[PDB]
Design brief:
part of a larger assembly, 8 chains, A alpha+beta (353), B mainly alpha (143), C mainly alpha (132), D alpha+beta (94), E alpha+beta (228), F little secondary structure (50), G mainly alpha (107), H alpha+beta (55), B: 143 residues, mainly alpha, 5 helices, H: 55 residues, alpha+beta, two-stranded antiparallel sheet, 2 strands, 7% strand, elongated, RNA-binding, AMP-dependent synthetase/ligase domain-containing protein (chain F), Large ribosomal subunit protein uL29m (chain G), RNA-binding (chain A)
Chain lengths: 353, 143, 132, 94, 228, 50, 107, 55
Amino acid sequence: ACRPGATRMKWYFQKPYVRRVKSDFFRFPLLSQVTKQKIDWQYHHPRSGYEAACIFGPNTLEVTNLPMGKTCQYLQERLWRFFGKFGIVEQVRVLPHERDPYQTCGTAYVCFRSRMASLRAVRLPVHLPASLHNRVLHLRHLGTDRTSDDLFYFRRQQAISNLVAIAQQLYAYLEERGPLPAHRALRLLFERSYPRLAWRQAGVSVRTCCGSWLGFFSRSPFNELFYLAREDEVSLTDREENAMLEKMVIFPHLLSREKLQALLLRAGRLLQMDLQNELSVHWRTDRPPLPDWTQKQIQLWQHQDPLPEELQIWSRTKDYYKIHEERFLFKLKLKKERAQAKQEMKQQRRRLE
Amino acid sequence: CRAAVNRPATRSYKRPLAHQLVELHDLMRERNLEQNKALEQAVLRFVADDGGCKRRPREVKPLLYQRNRRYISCPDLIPDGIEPARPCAEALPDVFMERQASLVRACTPEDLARQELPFAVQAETAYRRLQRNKRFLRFVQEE
Amino acid sequence: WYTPPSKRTWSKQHNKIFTPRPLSERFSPHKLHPEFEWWRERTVQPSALFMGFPDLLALPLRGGSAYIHEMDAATLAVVLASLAHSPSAYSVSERRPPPSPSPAVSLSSSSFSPTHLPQHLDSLLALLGRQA
Amino acid sequence: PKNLNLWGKYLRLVGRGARRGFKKWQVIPPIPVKAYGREPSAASQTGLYHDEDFNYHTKRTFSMRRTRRKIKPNVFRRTFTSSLLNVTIPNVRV
Amino acid sequence: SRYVKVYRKVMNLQRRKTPLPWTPTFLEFSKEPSVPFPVREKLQPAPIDLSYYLNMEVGDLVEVLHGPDCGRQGVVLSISKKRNTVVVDGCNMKKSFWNPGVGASLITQEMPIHITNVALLDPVVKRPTRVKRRFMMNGECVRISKLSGSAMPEPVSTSALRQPNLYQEYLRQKALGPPLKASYARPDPLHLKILQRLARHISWGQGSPLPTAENPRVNSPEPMALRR
Amino acid sequence: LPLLHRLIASFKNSPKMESHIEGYVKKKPIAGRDWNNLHAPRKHWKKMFL
Amino acid sequence: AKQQKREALETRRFQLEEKMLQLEHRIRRMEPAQSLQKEAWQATLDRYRSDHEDILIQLHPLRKETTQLLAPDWRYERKYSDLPGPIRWKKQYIPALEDQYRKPIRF
Amino acid sequence: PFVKLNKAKRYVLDNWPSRNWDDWSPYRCYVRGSRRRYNIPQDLLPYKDELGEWH
RNA sequence: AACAGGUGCCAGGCCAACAAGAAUCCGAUCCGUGUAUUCCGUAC
RNA sequence: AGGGCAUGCAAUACCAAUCAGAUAACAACUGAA
RNA sequence: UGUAACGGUACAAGCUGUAAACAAAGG
RNA sequence: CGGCGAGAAGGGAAGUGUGUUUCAAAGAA
RNA sequence: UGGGAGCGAAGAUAAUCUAAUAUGUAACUCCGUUCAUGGAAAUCAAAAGAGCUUUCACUGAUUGUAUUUAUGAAACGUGAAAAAAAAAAAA
RNA sequence: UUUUUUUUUU
């Protein structure tokens, strides 16, 4: 046992704060709306939430809801990488923990080189993998008081669902009434709100996901369910779209229950994939390449290289293992020789191409 | 049924049902088998614990008591005018010196047949005896 | 050495030259610690200090004694100047403040008097003058 | 095995006894402090010795002899101009 | 080293609460006697109730001195004199378990803390201090602090500090056994009553036959005859 | 049910007495009481004939 | 008795100061521009100024009274008196004094 | 089907909800006596991070 | 193990605030919880 | 615990790089615990 | 917390802390 | 009277013949 | 405290002597013990399959290191005790 | 076939 380093980190659960007595301000201090902490008038000063602006600048962000058990420096690099997409990041600052300098409190500041570049990062939130506790980041603009959309994902899900249901209803209607006009059939469709289920006219989910009625039909799974036909068979605003729709007839496709179900199911996976891809963009888009050295450097920030075997050899216990064994060395020599033969096969393809 | 009723009431355990027990009881009664030892023992055990629904911690009767234990006061419940029987006038004779002739008698084919009986009949006999030997004292007002 | 390191126990610090980490330190709350000497009492040091002396601006709120009569000319001049050049209450120190910055960062011309009004220092002023 | 980056490849999947009875004079060359898990030294805590610290080594001749000796790291004196601090820092052991 | 095993084995005995329960069987003997008893010293200072002397009451405001909770204030919930321990809300939470009721899947509970690890805060000063009792002419008892010399506030009502103990409930549920089967759990009073009725006839029947439609009668119980 | 039995069973919830744990066996010696123990105080001797 | 009112007063003042600071920052952010919002904020800040000053006026008496025994009193000391009911205090650490060279003289 | 369940086995089959066959579904299953239900056709596959890198 | 203490030395029935014999015979001085016989209380 | 309770055990550590003392302007100045 | 010195007590391997073997009665 | 949503990183280790097996350096009582 | 980390010699055995055992043992400094240590696989196995960590028994004084003297709770595997993947976007 | 777990009614 000895003094731990930065590798060792501990964190316990936090019990929610409940005021049992309202008239006892001594034993049950009132919470603060800014610092989210007990009001300490005796030793703490009142805050305003705009102190970082005078420090950094107007063109700044207030990121919150950070994970635990991660170094501030690692978080800074991660954040810089993330934020670099929009524009040139000036500086990233992280507030250490009160009781743990090697740990993050849960708040950070980001500075941009430009106003418009900063503005673009406020739109959507930040989603983290399982590695980071799946902690969703909350942003705020100090210059504009603009916040991010935290409910984007959950609202999209309901859209997906509504699409599914509208498809089903359309199919049913078609079945029950034969072919119907394009402009007339659509009126028999409804959707539901995300916050609380309430019947509403369809089209919000269509515009959200698909973006257009035409597109809805032109989709991959959707096209196998329905068929549009031009008036002779028997870059567009809302009015033009409507006018085009006014002279078309919808025809269903004869399908079985199992097939129908399968298709319906597939649609959802596709839609979900879409959503995921929207939130999982790369960090190296519209950027020049990087040297291998740089790549290595990047790698180092996450993962360490293996130890040389030369050194590792010494680790062998003399009790049960021979330090320097000729057969053991010969085996490693043969493995090293086989490595080049393996590499040549991969290298030959580039010359062939 | 007797073997299974004693098992726990967990997932990984086979246990019969109350209606199954009644159906089996009727089926056995029909064939003049209502007086079954195993059936009676299973029936008593089933209701001993509400068909396994009730559960209590493991309980072991005490076989010894500590010195200077607690004292509990209680009056006699036996009806008045009742006392234990007294022994014979002084003592019995010696076992080896006097009781040497009366302890031995000639054997008979009936004795041989009685000795050649199985264990199940003995066990049944015992059970029946204990069953039959269940009585209590009456009260003046009870009569 | 007997046991090898791992992904969690490969970084260590010196016994004396180290960084306190109560959050990440072995402890036994359920055990008596004679090392801390729970019997021995300790004084109460001042929370705010200015030029090595108790902060005069924190007196009205936190209270405490003032060693005005022990000040020298050098100290007293600056002290006087401080109380004359538009003093601010946020200049005082804080005991375990929130991780976020303090209002002292800006120190701009405000439209109000934080904590106390300027009229609550004549008592101290008198003493200051006397000392002068 | 696990933790390949660290020393002791051939020591993890062995008996407890082996581990307990492992000797230190069986290794000729030095081992990196980061890999070995050695505690930082006072001289290192007062300077910037990124991967450098006091180590130990052992000798061996034809006569099956063995010894152990101490070895000091390599340290230099320099000067660095810090723009943020706005003050020179003379005599920095690096 | 070739002594670790034995060392540990020996050491274990200290912690061992010998003798332990042991059910008997057929042709089997106990081994508890063969277990050496732990070693202990008798001559030592007598215990003391620090709670009593420190004038520390349930519901009082305390602050954590050491441990993970370097600075954290709370309210005393429970005091144990024999262990010289206190329980403070929102501090020292390490005991986790499965949810025995409605809610999440895991629930934690606060753990006791040594009295020596905590101190009473000053009313006005809000710093660790001491409290002394003083009796008036009328017999009225007043608690006065050292630093400020001010009167202490009254304790919080027990009705407000009363909370349910889910750890105990989980232990009680575990003591019984695994969860019951769905099939078995279902009630059946209709057949249970028939089985209960047959149980009395089997037990207190004295071997008498059961009633029948043609012969709805049963022999009466026989009393215990005295030895004339 | 018997009236007497009812009466008797009435007192089932009465307090019980102390009892030993399951499989309680008293430890007893084999060897004699006489043995040299010269590493004991003056007032703690047991030698009579050995 | 007095402590309790002090507490509440303090709390209220604490809240009001944060609101006033937020309004002043919002006013400062839009200096080179004129609008109705700015006027609105000025009005609200004006209101809060009085709303806060009253609190301090009410608070003044209590703070003094509360902080009674905090400071030493020679009168209550065992050195200068012998009457029942003594008072003791703990020595502080003043760097300004500790860093100075002084002889152990008493006159 | 002919398995002699031991203490160890019985414990698992009686405690762990994953062994509960009365509520078995091929699309939603636990992993090892877990409380939370995982998506077998979804949870078994990798995913990309905010950075677009594999996870 | 009625080692639970005391009473002049070995006490279930004597003092010990709640059950139960100043029990009979024997005894060198010499009380004597001692030998022999017998009764009673006990969820102690 | 109503009340009272001299003196000594070198004590700003209920906190905070290391190195004498009432715990040291930089540098000189060094270190296996 | 544990201990050493001085004083008192009957100068003591106990007790005790100049209030140094006690307040027991607040209308 | 079961028929191409037929996929999950391109990287580590194993025989040195690997069309073979396994795994993911990267998360909490 | 025969627990963990740094450093760490000799008397003694080999009937003197080198390696080796003693022993990573003794002295010195530090952590202060189940609210601990440890840890949920780029592991083991080889063509079957096991499934974080930890304690006991057997395999077995077998394999291995040594040799003139010893040392060695080895790995796979079996039995048994205790059983634990993650509470979790915010209000 | 040579066995076996007692409460009904907190």
